């Protein structure tokens, strides 16, 4: 769909050059560097929600999902897993 | 797709009975109660990643996205916004 | 001082009965259960700060430090370590 | 004791030059910039605990408490409040 393409792009540059891209620099830095970002975006999501800044909220929630996908890719998993897991629950 | 249906389901019971469902109890409790859960799942995502528990990771990341969607719905927004925001960036 | 006494109390019931106390139940539950709480109080601290609820802020920051101390105790460490580490930096 | 001195130092440079110190730059940046740090150190505390890196754990928990104090100072409060609040509970 859209996430699949992003996932494929992530896996593509999974083991690319550290300077190649941002996603590449993350993967090279490691698990911690990725988790930092996840936590960061999660906190910003809270802040955004509190400030009723609906535009910032969406940007952060997106940045959160994105880094979450970067994390999944680091663990040899991918979006669909999460989507299917979501499906398995509700509905 | 799958998220759209979940979103529609969330909006449906947005102002339902507090005892109707879990999602309903959350909405009734408020913003804070929703944010607690978002933060919770974010933390668990970190723990899961560290423990290399790939199955727990996916379950949590999904619970995170789910509550993130609950948050969006609380603010009169929805998944597609995040998906399109994701598209606007990468690609 | 005050933290020392709390620390001593924590270490005291470190390996007590699971039903003995709350602190005891935590230790029995494990590392994760303790980290959940640390993250929870951290999030609430953010929320409280945002809502300018100065009384709730102090209650949460305290709950945070407390669980942080429970964490340290779980790792065979203690408050003074943190205090001294704080001293070593500023001043 | 030790925290009191740090608190006093924080309040001292509360409204100092943005370039004066790190604590000064934070206060100038705002509430959000301080909350970012609190969340950051909280997440690092989780990571450290998981990696059993006991030395990093104490360094982070201390950085956490420190930024928590910076937060308190930003809200015209101070350490003793948290310490007393801690006392009021246990013991």
Swiss-Prot record, chains A, B, C, D:
Species annotation: Chromobacterium violaceum (strain ATCC 12472 / DSM 30191 / JCM 1249 / CCUG 213 / NBRC 12614 / NCIMB 9131 / NCTC 9757 / MK)
UniProt family annotation: Belongs to the PRA-PH family.
Full-sequence portion shown in this chain: 4 to 94 of 108
Pathway: Amino-acid biosynthesis; L-histidine biosynthesis; L-histidine from 5-phospho-alpha-D-ribose 1-diphosphate: step 2/9
Designated name of the protein: Phosphoribosyl-ATP pyrophosphatase
A GO molecular-function annotation: phosphoribosyl-ATP diphosphatase activity
Enzyme class, spelled out: hydrolase
Catalytic activity from the UniProt record: 1-(5-phospho-beta-D-ribosyl)-ATP + H2O = 1-(5-phospho-beta-D-ribosyl)-5'-AMP + diphosphate + H(+)
Entry GO terms, CC: cytoplasm
Keyword Cytoplasm: yes
GO biological-process terms attached to the record: L-histidine biosynthetic process
Listed EC numbers: 3.6.1.31
Key word Acetylation present: no
Domain of life: Bacteria
Compartments, record wording: Cytoplasm
Keywords from the named record: Amino-acid biosynthesis, ATP-binding, Cytoplasm, Histidine biosynthesis, Hydrolase, Nucleotide-binding
């Amino acid at each position: 769909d859209v996430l699949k393409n992003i996932a494929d792009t992530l896996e593509a540059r999974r083991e690319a050059a550290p300077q190649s891209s941002y996603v590449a620099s993350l993967f090279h830095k490691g698990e911690d560097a990725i988790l930092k970002k996840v936590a960061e975006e999660a906190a910003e999501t809270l802040m955004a929600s509190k400030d009723k800044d609906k535009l910032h909220l969406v940007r952060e929630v997106a940045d959160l999902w994105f880094h979450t996908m970067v994390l999944l890719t680091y663990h040899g998993l991918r979006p669909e897993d999460v989507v299917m897991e979501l499906h398995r629950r509700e509905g």
